[PDB]
Amino acid sequence: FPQSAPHGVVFLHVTYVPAQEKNFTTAPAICHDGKAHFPREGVFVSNGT
Amino acid sequence: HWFVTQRNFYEPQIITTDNTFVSGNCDVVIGIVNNTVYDPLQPELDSFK
Amino acid sequence: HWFVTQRNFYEPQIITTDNTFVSGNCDVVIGIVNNTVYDPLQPELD
Ligand SMILES: *[C@@H]1O[C@H](CO)[C@@H](O[C@@H]2O[C@H](CO)[C@@H](O)[C@H](O)[C@H]2NC(C)=O)[C@H](O)[C@H]1NC(C)=O
Ligand SMILES: *[C@@H]1O[C@H](CO)[C@@H](O)[C@H](O)[C@H]1NC(C)=O
Numbered sequence: 001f002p003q004s005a006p007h008g009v010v011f012l013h014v015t016y017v018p019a020q021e022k023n024f025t026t027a028p029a030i031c032h033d034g035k036a037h038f039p040r041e042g043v044f045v046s047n048g049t
Numbered sequence: 050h051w052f053v054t055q056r057n058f059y060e061p062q063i064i065t066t067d068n069t070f071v072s073g074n075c076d077v078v079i080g081i082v083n084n085t086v087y088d089p090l091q092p093e094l095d096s097f098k
Numbered sequence: 099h100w101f102v103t104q105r106n107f108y109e110p111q112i113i114t115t116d117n118t119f120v121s122g123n124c125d126v127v128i129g130i131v132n133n134t135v136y137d138p139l140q141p142e143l144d
Contacts, residue, residue: 040070060121068119089115090139097143 051084063087100133112136 003010025046030037052061053068062068064086075081101110102117111117114136124130 041072062119062121065119067115089137093137093139094143 051082065089100131 001012001014003012025048027044027046029039030044051064053064054060054062066086066088069086100113102113103110113133118135
């Protein structure tokens with residue numbers, strides 16, 4: 001949102017910074033019965049099991 | 050009905066699993082549309098069995 | 099035969115509906131070449 005100032009302009013950039021994160025046992029891909037699979041939007045993760 | 054078209058030239062297309070991928074669930078989906086698509090495998094099996 | 103390859107490297111593949119979408123009616127485009135794609139459902143009903 002722009003904001004006027006005397007002989008200048010002041011912005012109010014609204015950002016989106018990720019908060020706390022957890023560690024996961026990712027993997028490049030996945031395959032069942034001899035058929036490699038790949039992620040389509042995100043990245044694979046693992047709850048642990 | 051809905052279409053899937055590129056972002057620079059209007060090319061309306063029949064939404065299909067051909068050019069669409071799934072990474073979520075209706076519960077997780079907001080304003081989910083109870084809208085169906087075409088699967089090019091069901092009618093063929095019943096016709097020729 | 100007709101093959102679908104990536105942009106830079108040359109890696110031919112069997113032209114399949116999984117790697118190609120549909121649009122239009124083929125009656126308006128120019129340069130269309132008649133060809134057959136593979137339907138995976140055929141072996142499942144033999
Ligand atoms: C899309 O389908 C969902 C499937 O549950 C519908 O959700 C239910 O719709 C019925 C319709 O009478 C309601 O009684 C339920 O309360 C809804 N929720 C559940 C958990 O059953 C949803 O309404 C459908 N959307 C539209 C626009 O019809
Ligand atoms: C491609 O198939 C259509 C289907 O009828 C036919 O009319 C057309 O002549 C074919 N193309 C060529 C080059 O023969």
